[PDB]
A paper describes a structure:
The central and universal element in genetic recombination as well as in double strand break repair and in the process of replication fork rescue is a four-way DNA heteroduplex called the Holliday junction. In prokaryotes, the two proteins RuvA and RuvB play critical roles in the processing of the Holliday junction by promoting the ATP-dependent unidirectional strand-exchange reaction known as active branch migration. In bacteria, the Holliday junction is processed by two homo-hexameric AAA+ ATPase RuvB motors, which assemble together with the RuvA–Holliday junction complex to energize the strand-exchange reaction. Here, using time-resolved cryo-electron microscopy, we obtained structures of the ATP-hydrolysing RuvAB complex in seven distinct conformational states, captured during assembly and processing of a Holliday junction. We show that RuvB motors rotate together with the DNA substrate, which, together with a progressing nucleotide cycle, forms the mechanistic basis for DNA recombination by continuous branch migration.
The first subpopulation contains particles that lack the centrally localized RuvA oligomer (s0−A). These clearly show that the four RuvB subunits A to D are occupied by ATPγS and subunits E and F are occupied by ADP. Notably, specific densities are visible at low density thresholds, indicating the partial presence of ATPγS and Mg2+, thus determining that an asymmetrically formed RuvB hexamer can carry up to five ATP molecules. Because ATP hydrolysis (s2→s3) precedes the acquisition of a new ATP molecule (s4→s5) in the nucleotide cycle, the simultaneous presence of ATP in subunits A and D suggests that state s0 is not part of the hydrolytic cycle. Moreover, we also noticed that the converter in state s0 assumes a hybrid conformation, which is different from any of the conformations seen in the nucleotide cycle (s1 to s5). Therefore, we hypothesized that such a state resembles a RuvB hexamer that has not entered the nucleotide cycle yet and therefore must first undergo ATP hydrolysis or exchange to adopt the position- and conformation-dependent sequence of the nucleotide arrangement as displayed throughout the states s1 to s5. We refer to such a state as the ‘initiation state’ (s0).
Numbering used by the authors:
A (entry chain F), B (entry chain E), E (entry chain B), F (entry chain A): 19 to 330
C (entry chain D): 19 to 331
D (entry chain C): 19 to 136, 141 to 331
DNA sequence: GAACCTTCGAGGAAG
DNA sequence: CTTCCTCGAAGGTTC
């Protein structure tokens, strides 16, 4: 499998790995579970993979679920009963869980017990459950999304960042070693430069280029071959997606560069507001294609020269 | 049947058709299942037809269902259990299935296994099931509405587009042969012009014109008879339909051509704004009948001269 | 009778009427049943009436039911067992159908057969029930809510439209001959003007004027009596009710045309929110007297010139 | 009895009353059933009373039920089977019937037949000629296809001072209480235009006259009783006067928001908006504005303050 | 007993008490049931207490229930029909009854009958159920929530008002004799002036001071003990709590008396916007310490002279 | 154990403790149940902990449940039937109960009875349930959500306050005994000054510092180790985060101390408009680093010296 | 003309 | 199916 299993295999995120190593080692001298950890940042950067590594280092099983998957208190109660001592519970998009369910975790995380009503009619009665020790791992896009009473109960916080070209190059070379394939260093660098700094995209592109090199080439990935393969896909010469081009083009042609609010833009491009906010705007801002102002977003001169317009 | 069964018979969609060929033959060389594929775009372009073509080229049994047909996780678990190695599962309107159902689809697509909670009260167990390799094929009219974590699982994407007159004329001819109807090469070109670029519409008109020529003619579809029949159907020589004319006419007469929002007073017509946004609006945009503006849609001079109103 | 029985008697709807006429003959020239037809349009335009005309002009027996009366797949089977070759099946409010039945309906429409369960427990078995050729006619007031697969099956589409003065005038004349009442053509036009384009409304107005004409007059509907009757009833020449007129006046006199919120307007006329939004407001929008905006309703220039008040931008 | 029995006894509603007389007399001349009638409008104006009058003029026996009592289609189908030719069915609070029942009523009204599934089989029942009468305060809640099948629509209006004065005098004779003509006018002004409110004040004044007087209502006893009840000569209550007073003396006539005004009088926000403001707006004492509500010149004159534009 | 039982013991409420006396006496001379009565107004002023007094003065048995207990028409139909001639039915929190249930009282209150369904299937029939004469009593804090047709059926309306210092002083002395406690008239007035006009608050203060007087004193309440106890509770001589004093001080010393917004004021005291607007601000306005204006809150001259500052 | 068990162990909250002591003793002398008490205030100050202490001082069994666990009236009625004379009932997060259930407590708290419907449903009647004497304890973070008639029934109100450095330092030392960690008195003061006056934050920081000193140290928290550990966690010596430091620096370097509007400032820091106002600005105002004004907010002299710039 | 504060109106989502 | 409530627009004042 492609997913790393141990910290020695996990490339990048040095600042996070440095802290997690110290807290995991200390928690292993003492015979007790690790404090609840919260990971936040852009999607697709590898925070789920981090949860598996933690479980393998602690030597316990990992269970996985998501906020939207829990709708009533009976769901969360049934899940917690299925945990063994020291197990790790991973909850994705924890910010999207219902408020009536969130207030059930408060007692579970802080004191390991839950008060519940059971039975029906004359049998209806309250019960006091006593849970075994466990570690919760939460995932969310931003810290300001969660309520103050919940955020205060997490003991560890991790912020994850985009990968740099030297890191993605090694990840691409690693992946191209599990597949019995050959890639030249110049090709690996070119393929990485197109991957928007995100490891998930890099794995998807490498698969498609591998197919093209088998049917349309000599079975080896080279700069001349990779250039054509990526040109056949919609990936621009600097990684911009077709959805990215739609946004930039709309701002210049229909809005004249702005200012425009992301809310109004979303309905004009027919994209869900949460996707443009969480997936597309973050990269476009951190790379100078879009600028933010008090009134709204504005396209920079770099965008005009890229899309082929005149920065009048 | 009318719909083609192999790539040799499938007309148009050259971009999509060329990509899938490379990936399909590469997947065979490796003797493995095809990656998950997402087909999206306007209705009636042949999205469903393409799913059958992939199944025949791979040589597998196709299974079919729709988003709204699945109501609880227990249903999808049964379907996923009823799969043979390599089977293709096609889900129409995937964007409409409930969030509670999508929970299971993530784990299946990512690792081919599912964990099902079972029991209630004192009964509280789960079972782990390993699925045989399969290929998921989804189809949607709305892409931007698809949940981001789901959209990231699809490895192959195809954007369907409107057919051009050379292709549509060839389709009109091919379809006429199955009806054993006699149509001249001139009359076949007339229907193509007014089909709005959608094969389903072209087939609808041809089926109706037959009944006209069998009474108002000598069973031969002549250009004059075809043109007289299309005017009887109220089909514009530009292919605008009853709903299309009703939109533009009200905008000009009641709002001086706009600008007006898509739902602002579309209540003054019967059509649900979702169909206007998904099936009527995109055609008019490509044909230059309407342009989008900061304040809504505005009728271009073409519409005025077409509808026969003096432009401002 | 009050309902027409043949295309000769069915006034108006020439576009849809002419199309159906051709398609029916082409089917009669062969041993084939008419294609499944879907009828669209606002309520009361004659959808139900058209179904009987189709059945009579086809020369076929009609079985009638409705969407609310069907609750489970077993109901359709019992009906399908009663149908006969070439019969027409009419289902009003087909959009009403419970989705569980909608899926099985596809096979009958497209394949003329359906699955049937027999036995119980270990003896449970599934078998096909074959069906003779038949034509389904579906009347629906809403189109975009029908599931896409169902819509793909329906072959012919027909849009019903509001009758215009030249045709609605003839319907009044025709109804005036079922009763023993004489009506002057000038009077018949005055009623048609106020019928909002709906045949059912024209008949209701005629019944009320008839009662007055035989109690407060000589039993004849002349232009003089028609004017007095339409004065007891407060229906404006545009067909605005007494309350409709009060709404417009209040907006212009007290708020300078608005914007004004729904709740504020309701308490001025002493009416419920739901009553204004559902009984009076809808027609005023169609005629273009008012518009809905983020800040509330606003009166248009057309409203000012009808009520007789000066207008200012 | 308090409820009038015939049109000659039914004071007011000249518009609705005149139309019904024409349609009822014409229907009799043809020996036909009366068209279906829907009565709607504000509370307490006479909707229920008018339904019984119609039955007495037609000379028929009235069947009575209510929306809340009909819970399932089987209930209505049973009631309909008991109808005889010319019978009148009256359904009060018709807006509460479940939609599963209203959809049955379409054909029963327009075609006089029902087709009900009932080993499952369909029985066709052909109903005799009958008239359905409905009364409701929320006519907008009825389905659009149901409203289209009623042939007569009666919209009720408020009453005038000369009509209410005669009602107060009539009711006083049933209580065998003596009341002077000018004393009756003083109650009519305070009745807000509603017959039920006029009767309620009369009952309270009768209690006062029997305990604090000689059991006779005169221009002197009435003024004392109305002073104890604290009802202004315009029909404003203690809380109504307190609202106007606060707006004029603390905010200079407004504009002021609903929340601020409610908190200043120690009232629940929903109670001020739904229980006091409606009458003040209809009488022209208050106006709603984009920035709040303001007291009009009529309010200054009534409360006794010098207006300043 | 802590709750008064007859009008001789019910202090205050002169307007409501005077009216009810006259209406009760007239009903007895006519020997008939009392008209329906609605009691409404602010919390804790004596609405529930007055309902029992009416029953003792009328000399009849009282049946008691509440809105939250009546959840379906079958319940109400079972409470009715069990009434005997002249009974009094008291429903507390009547505003909670479902609106579909309220509409059953319409004919019961006006005509003393209800329409019920009887029999089954083809034997089903509707019959009138006739009720004996009865008096309905309702109490609510949210009168505006009742339907217009229901409020119009109540024949007597009682709106409660706040008490005055002479009456509250007498109430404290009465309660001080139920418990074994001696209290000086000077001390009784000292508590009354701090009770915000509400009898329940006066009783609460007395209970708290009693605990101190028998633990830190000789078991007697006197001016010396009362002043010390009220200093521990930290209740200003105007009835202002510790948080109330902090609000006024902040407005005078930092903002020069205002205008200031609610958000800015809430953040400076570490409170939250909803508690300040719902718990504390209401009484400060009703007593004239704060004034609300289009620009913000402003402190009045009355506040300056209370806190000891100069109204410069 | 972490949670103090008795008033001798509960450090701080002198004002709350002093009152509770007097009221608890007076109740015991009379041999009566304690009056209903409501605890409210900011998160993590000790509300839950105090509820258990009160139960130990009274010497009675504690019955525990939570607001979100009570879904309907039948649940609450079942709990009340399980009470015994003198029992204490504790409802945490009492603000989450639905209004239809909250109005059942009105009669229970004042008169110890409840109206209930009983019977076969063919025949049924209302009946009183009579409750034994009991003390209801409620805890909530926002009292403003409780209806006015409920709050008026609580006889004892406890408002919690933030801890001072002298008291907060002792809590840090106490916790070091449980973890068996030697801590220098100087190091205890450093952690206390960075804990924002909140005990939960202080305990969280101590656990992180403890893990660091035992993995790369000799198992002693000295003044030198603490500085290194706190630098890794990135907690300023005033408890400010990098975001808080970024805010203050931007106002000083780009605006000369302001005034600046919230919208303009948010853009210059790449933060969300509403997040900054709800998350970070509250603590900056309370400490006096920022001051709000009618024209914007201004950095005070205290913020200048902390950042090292020269004030003018 | 940048920044704060209040009030209203129409959606939508939590029972 | 209904209540509750929250997001967006705009009128008005001050430096
Ligand atoms: N073209 C027509 N000529 C004469 N009478 C007509 C015509 N169209 C409709 N009517 C009459 O109008 C009345 C109502 O017609 P329907 O067909 O029942 O309306 P509808 O579409 O069924 O209304 P619904 O079912 O409530 S949506 C009947 O009395 C018909 O006889
Ligand atoms: N014209 C009238 N003359 C005399 N009494 C009248 C008149 N109209 C109404 N009343 C009396 O007013 C009271 C209320 O009349 P109703 O008919 O019950 O009002 P309503 O329309 O039923 O109000 P609802 O049902 O609550 S919406 C009864 O006592 C009637 O006798
Ligand atoms: N006039 C009075 N004289 C003596 N005690 C009084 C008086 N009015 C009220 N009380 C006491 O005040 C307390 C509260 O009165 P209640 O009648 O319960 O208030 P309330 O109207 O029921 O408040 P709710 O129900 O929460 S809105 C009781 O202990 C009464 O005995
Ligand atoms: N540091 C890394 N080294 C190797 N592979 C990685 C790394 N980070 C991510 N990946 C790969 O990219 C994908 C990341 O998926 P996942 O961890 O689920 O991202 P997320 O959890 O953010 O959705 C996986 O296929 C994973 O193997
Ligand atoms: N390229 C094509 N060649 C032949 N027939 C086509 C083609 N595209 C569409 N059609 C025909 O038009 C219809 C398309 O329907 P379908 O594939 O269901 O559209 P969609 O799935 O996009 O709604 C079918 O009847 C099919 O035979
Ligand atoms: Mg009470």
């Amino acid at each position: 499998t492609l997913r790393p299993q141990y910290f020695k295999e996990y490339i990048g995120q040095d600042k996070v790995k440095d802290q997690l190593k110290i807290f995991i080692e200390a928690a292993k001298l003492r015979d007790e579970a690790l404090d609840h950890t919260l990971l936040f940042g852009p999607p697709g950067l590898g925070k789920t993979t981090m949860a598996f590594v933690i479980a393998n280092e602690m030597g316990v099983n990992l269970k996985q679920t998501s906020g939207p998957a829990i709708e009533k208190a009976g769901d969360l109660v049934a899940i917690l009963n299925d945990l063994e001592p020291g197990d790790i519970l991973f909850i994705d998009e924890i910010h999207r869980m219902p408020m009536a369910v969130e207030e059930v975790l408060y007692s579970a995380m802080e004191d390991y017990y839950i008060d519940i009503m059971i039975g029906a009619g004359e049998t209806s009665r309250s019960v006091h459950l006593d849970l075994p020790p466990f570690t919760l791992v939460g995932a969310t896009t931003r810290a300001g999304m969660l309520s103050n009473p919940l955020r205060a109960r997490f003991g560890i916080n991790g912020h994850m960042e985009y990968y740099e070209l030297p890191d993605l190059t090694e990840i691409v070379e690693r992946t191209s070693e599990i597949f019995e394939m050959t890639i030249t260093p110049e090709a690996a660098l070119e393929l990485a430069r197109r991957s928007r700094g995100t490891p998930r995209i890099a794995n998807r592109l490498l698969k498609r280029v591998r197919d093209y090199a088998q049917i349309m080439g000599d079975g080896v990935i080279d700069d001349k071959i990779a250039d054509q393969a990526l040109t056949m896909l919609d990936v621009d010469h600097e990684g911009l997606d077709y959805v990215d081009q739609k946004i930039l083009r709309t701002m210049i042609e229909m809005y004249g560069g702005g200012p425009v609010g992301l809310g109004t833009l979303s309905v004009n491009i027919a994209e869900e507001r949460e996707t443009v906010e969480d997936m597309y705007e973050p990269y476009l801002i951190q790379k100078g294609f879009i600028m933010r102002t008090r009134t709204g977003r504005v396209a920079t001169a770099k965008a005009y020269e890229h899309m082929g317009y005149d920065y009048t």
